[PDB]
Design an enzyme around this catalytic site. Structure first.
Site: not given
Ligand SMILES: [Zn+2]
Ligand SMILES: [Zn+2]
Lengths: 154, 154
Positions: A47, A64, A72, A84, A121
């Site tokens: 992200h 984000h 999202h 995204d 992540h």
């Molecule tokens: Zn997002």
């Protein structure tokens, strides 16, 4: 002016890598490619977060990058954050050979990701399909393992 | 777009710091402040370099940000790189409490420094008054002690 960007990812653990961005036309997609190592096998959320702020590590990058205030999603969705980019996949050696193409992020204009933070992540991104509050925010992708500020490149 | 930027400086040695940038009016001056520590007492060259590329440490930032193709100067000069912020001064405890106001750098438009590299140098910047070819290119400020990509801040 910018047609190339680059990002060095580091964190507290072993996750590290280099990601390249290329946008030949300002009205065209951005190519995203490179290598991240030190990852566990499988999916990892990938992200662009709002701030190129690393004062407190990856946490300072904020949520984000979401200038249209959407929920999202995955990169194929119309309902998505600008930042995204879905998942990247690490092989059994811990290496994610990233190759993505995306026409929502940009190297100029409103959706410009230059001087924001690329984060990789802990867990998979559920692409906003998880059915809890958290899915619609971060896709349940967990910890920030490595990040960097996205920089203008030669 | 941007009214605040931030830069985390890191290097191979002990030099480290956080620099903030603030520009309330797009056509007004930029405030630069914060602190860098681990420096030798004295003057250090403080420049914005062209590329926010850290793939090979500070070297891969390239030369001073120079979008108008001019010669190195002091910030008070007319003949200067956009990237010429002159010197910062580290005190006897090795701290530079940076405080700089500049009218050439910008957080938006074509002089925009977001996504470029801030470098703190080994030696004084001679402001282009040093008589060699080096002076009109780098002010003889020497090697790069710490750098970071300038990022969008909250
Ligand atoms: Zn997002
Ligand atoms: Zn210069």
């Amino acid at each position: 002016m910018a047609t190339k960007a680059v990002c060095v990812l580091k964190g507290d653990g072993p996750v590290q890598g280099i990601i390249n961005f290329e946008q030949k036309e300002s009205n065209g997609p951005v190519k995203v490619w490179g290598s991240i190592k030190g990852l566990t096998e499988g999916l990892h959320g990938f992200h662009v977060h709002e701030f190129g702020d690393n004062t407190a590590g990856c946490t300072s990058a904020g949520p984000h990058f979401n200038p249209l205030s959407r929920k999202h999603g995955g990169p194929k969705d119309e309902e998505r954050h600008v930042g995204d980019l879905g998942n990247v996949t690490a092989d059994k050696d811990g290496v994610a050979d990233v190759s993505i193409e995306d026409s929502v992020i940009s190297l100029s204009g409103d959706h410009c990701i230059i001087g924001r933070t690329l984060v990789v992540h802990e867990k998979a991104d559920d692409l906003g399909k998880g059915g809890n509050e958290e899915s619609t925010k971060t896709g349940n992708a967990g910890s920030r393992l490595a990040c960097g500020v996205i920089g203008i490149a030669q």
